[PDB]
Design a protein around this ligand. Structure first.
Ligand SMILES: Nc1ccc(S(=O)(=O)Nc2ccccn2)cc1
Ligand SMILES: [Cl-]
Ligand SMILES: [Cl-]
Ligand SMILES: [Cl-]
Ligand SMILES: [Cl-]
Ligand SMILES: [Cl-]
Ligand SMILES: [Mg+2]
Length: 348
């Protein structure tokens, strides 16, 4: 067991191993508080996240377990991984606090799309890395559910990592109105049309790739219905085959109230783009999720010919998510989480 020391950073007690030095507040959502630190064992600058109220409800206890299972599993160059997890507790009986440690990320994709000039070669390399990461995540039957520019870390060498997986957090108010939180969402999840699956993440990649090519948001809706009208004007209104797959009768009645529109010419929308980029956007931005290109298929598209290496696009180890259908008490979720903290083995 390492030696721990205590300090107060902005009205919060931090109790951490001596290896972590020079802690400074970086931010705080409703999920926890984050400090930057120097890790003397590895020589990396790190982010240390102290969870808030991890075991306050069954919902919160299961979310804590879900987050630690997911971060312990992810071992890929284009996905955030876990450097360390610790608790100052010496037994299950006094266990209350969970701390997660990752590499400190500088810039997100928003800090390069808004203020930097991008060549086609930059767009090829950035979208290639998102898809390489997604091939890995989807091979474990994990859905990210919240891909958007603020959830993609990028360095000076244009190297990219996916972070901030959807742990089923987002609220109704968070998705309301003129908000980036909704602009990258597939229409079937935005309006609860049907049981969604991993295809929702490829819709989000289409929206991100369009914005790297034009420097503008693709579907900046002022509300859910405004956003749907922007989407259907580009890709066309649904045919009979998709309408059959929408489970809400009321959602089917609403779609049938709209005037029919054909799919637009994407070469006239993405003026001057590489024809191969236009072709790949037509294959991602398909209304029927069954007919969208997959991550594995997209990596073999001619747009990525300069970067594609089928011997360096790995898949994940199998991931058991059977806990998701399990009904447990707060103290049972807390015991499972405690076991996952004490069994953690750091990377080389
Ligand atoms: N996409 C993205 C999000 C957050 C940050 S950070 O500068 O807060 N750095 C962090 C935050 C959490 C974990 C690691 N680094 C940088 C990039
Ligand atoms: Cl230590
Ligand atoms: Cl990482
Ligand atoms: Cl504790
Ligand atoms: Cl964003
Ligand atoms: Cl597993
Ligand atoms: Mg985020």
């Amino acid at each position: 067991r390492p030696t721990f020391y205590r300090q107060e950073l902005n009205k919060t007690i931090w109790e951490v191993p001596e290896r972590y030095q020079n802690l400074s507040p970086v931010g705080s959502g409703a999920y926890g508080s984050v400090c930057a630190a120097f890790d003397t064992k590895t020589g990396h600058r790190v982010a240390v996240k102290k969870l808030s109220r991890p075991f306050q409800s069954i919902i919160h206890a299961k979310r804590t377990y879900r987050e630690l299972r997911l971060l312990k599993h992810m071992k890929h160059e284009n996905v955030i991984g876990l450097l360390d997890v610790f608790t100052p507790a010496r037994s299950l009986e006094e266990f209350n606090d969970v701390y997660l440690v990752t590499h400190l990320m500088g810039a997100d994709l928003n800090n390069i799309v808004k203020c930097q000039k991008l060549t086609d070669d930059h767009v090829q390399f950035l979208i290639y890395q998102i898809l390489r990461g997604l091939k890995y995540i989807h091979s474990a039957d994990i859905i990210h559910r919240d891909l958007k520019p603020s959830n993609l870390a990028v360095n000076e060498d244009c190297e990219l990592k996916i972070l901030d997986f959807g742990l089923a957090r987002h609220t109704d108010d968070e998705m309301t109105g003129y908000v980036a939180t909704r602009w990258y969402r597939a229409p079937e999840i935005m309006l609860n049309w049907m049981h969604y699956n991993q295809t929702v993440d490829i819709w989000s990649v289409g929206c991100i790739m369009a914005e790297l090519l034009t420097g503008r948001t693709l579907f900046p809706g002022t509300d859910h219905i405004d956003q749907l009208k922007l989407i259907l004007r580009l890709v066309g209104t649904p045919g009979a085959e998709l309408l059959k797959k929408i489970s809400s009768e009321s959602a089917r009645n609403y779609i049938q109230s709209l005037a029919q529109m054909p799919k637009m010419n994407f070469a006239n929308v993405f003026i001057g783009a590489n024809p191969l980029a236009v072709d790949l956007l037509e294959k991602m931005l398909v209304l029927d999720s069954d007919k969208r290109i997959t991550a594995a298929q997209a990596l073999a598209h001619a747009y990525f010919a300069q970067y594609h290496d089928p011997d360096d696009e790995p898949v994940a180890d199998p991931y058991d998510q059977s806990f998701e259908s399990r009904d447990l008490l707060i103290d049972e979720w807390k015991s499972l989480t405690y076991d996952e903290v004490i069994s953690f083995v750091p990377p080389p």
